[model samples]
Target: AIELLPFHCPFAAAVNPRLAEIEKLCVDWIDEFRLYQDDAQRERLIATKAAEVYARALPNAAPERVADVAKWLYWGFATDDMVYDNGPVSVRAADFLPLIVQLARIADEPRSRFGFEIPYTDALRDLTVAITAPATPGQRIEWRSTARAWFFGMSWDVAYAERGEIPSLNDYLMMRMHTGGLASWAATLGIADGFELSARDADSPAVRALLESWSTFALIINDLMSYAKEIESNIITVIARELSCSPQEAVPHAYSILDRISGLFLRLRADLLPGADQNLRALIAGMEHTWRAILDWGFTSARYTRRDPGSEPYQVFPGWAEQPHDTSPDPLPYPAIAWWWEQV
Candidate 1:
């Protein structure tokens, strides 16, 4: 089934009104902080439109902190690229474990623990300060946990890539929950919006499950939107790799997966509301905000829409890609993602 399908939330994602300011802040911050290697590296980030993409992602984030959000976005990509995206560094997972371990520790220990330091670590220290400034100890702990989860996922991805292996559907979902840094991104909504939750509640089964569902949804959508680029580059996505299907074959399944997961998400989210006290309800609302932004951002993010001039662009978007809303739901594909919808 070589169908070009639309995921839900079709339309030009109206962005934060602070778009220009946020973008300028990102460019200027990179210059001031020296986040990258050289002009070429900085230009690559600008060309990919990282700040614009994240500004759209965190549309609910404070206008003042949008640049901080962008900086965090680029910092992740920069360190991610250096650690795993390409070349020798991509394969050597060991070198990164220590660095990220130290990065994680900065949440508790103010001083750098490791002997050696570089621009990335320096920025990490500053980012830690900025993020921790307003965060309550509880919120800060959640963010720290999020980063630790991300690094754990990164290590697993490197190991998996080393084997040139593809995971089963469950394994992929499990790994990707942390790997994509979606958990971390999801945590930001609660913190940024100043929604309060007890550390116990935040780590509870209900909250954790919603966070997983939210992260899994975004990761699948990311793979779906970037299918062509990703297929040519690798076979990391579960829908594409688990089915052992070509990119074209994977599209319908990807759509099928989205619908199933969305069903599961909505179904599970229903439980969360009744179970929560007022504060927990506020936390869930912020999650809903982040979740909607994750869905909508793809439609208009330059990171997805803009094409690389010299690269062979993949023409895999839906016929309704430009439409405000053109899709109707289809039944979930059996043995692909049916297991997901029924979970809740």
Candidate 2:
């Protein structure tokens, strides 16, 4: 059984009081959209506890906003399952391109009905309308931009999958940043809680570093917990293949990288807090909550932990680590992300 490495998050656990209420809203949305093909599909989707994660992540949001974010999560997960993970287009870059074009169009131009009958098309339109309806122009720009990045990242994965190639660690990390959903996830925070960063603050080096570090940490946590049910190539499997080591051996290395990112996130956040404006602080706090929620939800969510009968129980580190293994403000070896350390 694989054990999750202890995380170095020092944030307190906080969940919106309306988690159950938001969950019910999400279930109704799922049914209304006809998101699942059958009862088993519905069960699997609900078992992910996606609404709970968003509620925990965005604890300060109004109940309706949490429900909005939860539906967005469901939309993304449904799209991932049907188009990117298990569908016929999953491995074919050529086929993925046309589908992504349609998906991207719906997000980019939400008013246009592109006449595509894709599984999640209408659901994505619903999410886009809800997300953009109340958002500022800046928030809308961020969402559309990050949503495009996410689609491009999925395309990247399709190319790799089609080739049956394991990405280099640096390449994998870059793609993971996009495919991990942090960009789109981060974009929703401002709209959910009613704060939007000025372009200057949003684009600052410190903010950029903080966001990347957060993305890196979240990606590693996901790769760690989802290793068992992880069907596509991931950091764990990629590292094992590249280093010619067992998956067990690769686990520690992945955690070490995670430790470095976590340590850097703390250091950067500390530096920024002294001068961070209100909106910036909210972003920082929201990210902290989101990361903690991922850790908490991973252990219990059937999405990550469900396995066949007679399988060994997965061992997990019971709580957060006292500190990360690496704490120095230095860059990791990856050329793609070395700039993150320089920002601090």
lDDT of 2 at 106: 82
The residue pairs found clashing in candidate 2 are none
- After TM-score superposition, the amount by which residue 76's alpha carbon in candidate 2 deviates from its true location, in angstroms, is 1.4
Can you give the lDDT of residue 240 in candidate 1? 63
| Residue pairs with clashing backbones, model 1 | none
Cα miss at 292, model 1 (Å)? Answer: 4.4
lDDT of 1 by residue, 1-344 (tens): 23456646422454667778878877787777887788767775665555665566556667656566566677777776566565564566776566567766765455755777645777777666766677777777778788788877877777766677666776676677778888777556556556667768766765666667667766776766655444332223556667677767766666665555655666667877887887677656555555455555554443454455344434434534333221334434444434444435
Candidate 2 lDDT, tens digit per residue, 118-154? 8767888887888788888988899888888988888
User: Global lDDT of each model?
Assistant: 0.63, 0.82
The most accurate candidate by lDDT is 2
Positional deviation of residue 151's Cα in model 2 after best superposition, in angstroms = 0.4
Which of the numbered candidates is closest to the native, going by highest TM-score?
Answer: 2
lDDT of 2: 0.82
Please report, as a residue range, the 10-residue window in candidate 2 with the lowest summed lDDT.
308-317
Q: Model 1 compared with the native: what TM-score?
A: 0.81
